[PDB]
């Protein structure tokens, strides 16, 4: 029972953003940190040990950068905004291409693994696959009846989306109907994630459940009453078959409005660990590259780092703003966290 607070000399607080920083993500091939803000800017921070690029999407009103994603090679940064535009920026901070526009806010966008497509979800109830080479929409899928809140690629051509309409559609480029629709949630679906093998889809909902789905059947395979309140985020550990950690147990993390964080063994359908230190809603969790640690961020203004084998608290950092997102660098020895007061913090865990 010792102290685990990351000391001031191991925390870099980056300032520049003029309002809430909703999102951040590390470059996969170097220690560049991308952040996205309600101030209508994304920023690329250089944390290399060998300095601040500002990517202006217009403080401008209602031009929030809502979403961002690095391609696998780390050469390009895709962003989505409140004004409905998907954009592609170079790692050097130049706007390469404005892809086109959803009608109103983009809520999520993701590169496919191959890096040739970008997938976006909009408040306009649709999803769009964009050609990243030509910078043009390839296909729009108008399947939902309410805002599309999240997307996750199953392959380089197949994906899932979830919605305020409580449904999950599995879609494929070239198909004008969903391949499959998962129904069973009774409230807004906030996130879905394919497992590392692409065989299982996890979903979480305002209906306080976590559901696990399979393409083989209509009903969810698992239906976990995971928390007492709305469940905001889920992540699979990068472990098990088809990962760099093939023998490690596959885990699912979940976190809730009720401030709890939990780790699940999905196969056995049970909760491995409950982490309870947070005191406010948790909006973000993320596994370290080797799956041995879990970061969680809360509006209690703390980042907590958990040992996924024991559930023990191993690191902590109290910042000055409510945390919207936490994320790990490629080496798994730095965590970035974007906060509501305009701060982005880099935590050195060595």
Swiss-Prot record:
GO molecular function annotations of the record: beta-catenin binding; histone binding; transcription cis-regulatory region binding; transcription corepressor activity
Biological process, per Gene Ontology: blastocyst hatching; chromatin organization; fat pad development; lipid catabolic process; multicellular organism growth; negative regulation of transcription by RNA polymerase II; positive regulation of canonical Wnt signaling pathway; positive regulation of DNA-templated transcription
Descriptive protein name: F-box-like/WD repeat-containing protein TBL1XR1
Impact noted for substituting residue 242 to E: Found in a patient with epilepsy; uncertain significance
Residue window of the full protein shown: 152 to 513 of 514
Disease as annotated in the protein's UniProt record: Pierpont syndrome: An autosomal dominant syndrome characterized by multiple congenital anomalies, global developmental delay, learning disability, palmar and plantar fat pads, and distinctive facial characteristics, especially when smiling. Intellectual developmental disorder, autosomal dominant 41: A disorder characterized by significantly below average general intellectual functioning associated with impairments in adaptive behavior and manifested during the developmental period. MRD41 patients manifest delayed psychomotor development, variable severity of intellectual disability, and delayed language. Non-specific dysmorphic features and autistic behavior is observed in some patients.
UniProt function note: F-box-like protein involved in the recruitment of the ubiquitin/19S proteasome complex to nuclear receptor-regulated transcription units. Plays an essential role in transcription activation mediated by nuclear receptors. Probably acts as integral component of the N-Cor corepressor complex that mediates the recruitment of the 19S proteasome complex, leading to the subsequent proteasomal degradation of N-Cor complex, thereby allowing cofactor exchange, and transcription activation.
Family under the similarity heading: Belongs to the WD repeat EBI family.
Tissue expression notes: Widely expressed including the pituitary, hypothalamus, white and brown adipose tissue, muscle and liver.
Domain notes per entry: The F-box-like domain is related to the F-box domain, and apparently displays the same function as component of ubiquitin E3 ligase complexes.
Gene name linked to the record: TBL1XR1
Intrachain disulfide bonds: none
Organism, as annotated: Homo sapiens
GO cellular component: histone deacetylase complex; mitotic spindle; nucleoplasm; nucleus; transcription repressor complex
WD repeat spans: 16-50, 60-99, 101-140, 143-181, 184-223, 226-274, 277-316, 318-350
């Amino acid at each position: 029972d010792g102290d685990v607070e990351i000391p001031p000399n191991k925390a870099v607080v980056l300032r520049g953003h003029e309002s809430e920083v909703f999102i951040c993500a590390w470059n996969p091939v170097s220690d560049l940190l991308a952040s996205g803000s309600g101030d209508s800017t994304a920023r690329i921070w250089n944390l290399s040990e060998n300095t601040q690029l500002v990517l202006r999407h217009c403080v401008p009103s209602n031009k929030d950068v809502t979403s961002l994603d690095w391609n696998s090679e780390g050469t390009l940064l895709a962003t989505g905004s409140y004004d409905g535009f998907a954009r592609i920026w170079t790692k050097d901070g130049n706007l390469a291409s404005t892809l086109g526009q959803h009608k109103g806010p983009i809520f999520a966008l993701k590169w496919n693994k191959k890096g040739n497509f970008i997938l976006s979800a909009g408040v306009d109830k649709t999803t769009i696959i964009w050609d990243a080479h030509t910078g043009e929409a390839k296909q729009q899928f108008p399947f939902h009846s309410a805002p599309a809140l999240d997307v996750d690629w199953q392959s380089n051509n197949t994906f899932a989306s979830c919605s305020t309409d409580m449904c999950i559609h599995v879609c494929k480029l070239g198909q004008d109907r969903p391949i499959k629709t998962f129904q069973g949630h009774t409230n807004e679906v906030n996130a879905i994630k394919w497992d590392p093998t692409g065989n299982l889809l996890a979903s979480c909902s305002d209906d306080m459940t976590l559901k696990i789905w399979s393409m083989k059947q209509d009903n969810c395979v698992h239906d976990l009453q995971a928390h007492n309140k709305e469940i905001y985020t889920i992540k699979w550990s990068p472990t098990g078959p088809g990962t760099n950690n093939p023998n490690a147990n596959l885990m699912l993390a979940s976190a809730s409005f009720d401030s709890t964080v939990r780790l699940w063994d999905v196969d056995r359908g049970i909760c491995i660990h409950t982490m309870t230190k947070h005191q406010e809603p948790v909006y973000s969790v993320a596994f370290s590259p080797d799956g041995r640690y879990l970061a969680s961020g809360s509006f209690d203004k703390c980042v907590h780092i958990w040992n996924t084998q024991t559930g023990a608290l191993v690191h902590s950092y109290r910042g000055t703003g409510g945390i919207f997102e936490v994320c790990w660098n490629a080496a798994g020895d730095k965590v970035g966290a974007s906060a509501s007061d305009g701060s982005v913090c880099v935590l050195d865990l060595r």
